Chain A
């Protein structure tokens, strides 16, 4: 019934929790703060695959 998917370091079964991040290399638009001098921004986070 063991399903696997873990590592055995120093005899202790370790799991890698799936990590969540905002996707890269996509363009998004943000209405910035009303007290902010800039009123809008278009951000893309650039990183190579």
Chain B
């Protein structure tokens, strides 16, 4: 297709994507996964006011719990950072307000799942704030447990942020990364007990590259060209957009330098 880096997708799913980068300089592959982890923005709870807390847990405990809750950030580009808006504290174009209240009416253990979050903000028709639920029963994240006679009443303001400021805005869980399966460019020196090949197992990516010939010498001038990556997303952003918005966030960082140079 287009000249430059190539992508051949091995596998894909709702929250997993497995693909092969081709004709890419290594620094781009690393710089991609760094921004893909901790600079692609996403909305998650960054403020909490607790009316009543009769639970075992402390409020700040419950507050930290709410921070790591997966909230939808598909249309997060249409939302704005609270520090950027002109509101007094938080407007409806920068903040999404959630409410949560549950009482132990049942004469048994009453849980507080993530589905019990209720949105009290004008959404303005964007796919924002809906808490992610992959739980089969639809409950989602188990936040807290309640006895009889216990209740919890709090309000959650969900703002927009970057995972560098706090890991709760993390859009992706874990990116798999292996570029040389046979170590044919000798970038790592193997630790061996009897035989390096017999102790260390074959990587799964070894099936997708050419086995070396020890009779041939070491290709000195060769460089890393083909990369094997697998991205996993928690759900706040679908997998395709995790990498894509990660690519785009990289461009926006580069252009700011290009723009700043024009200013000088």
A–B direct contact (CB < 8 Å): no
Binding site for B on A (CB under 8 A): none
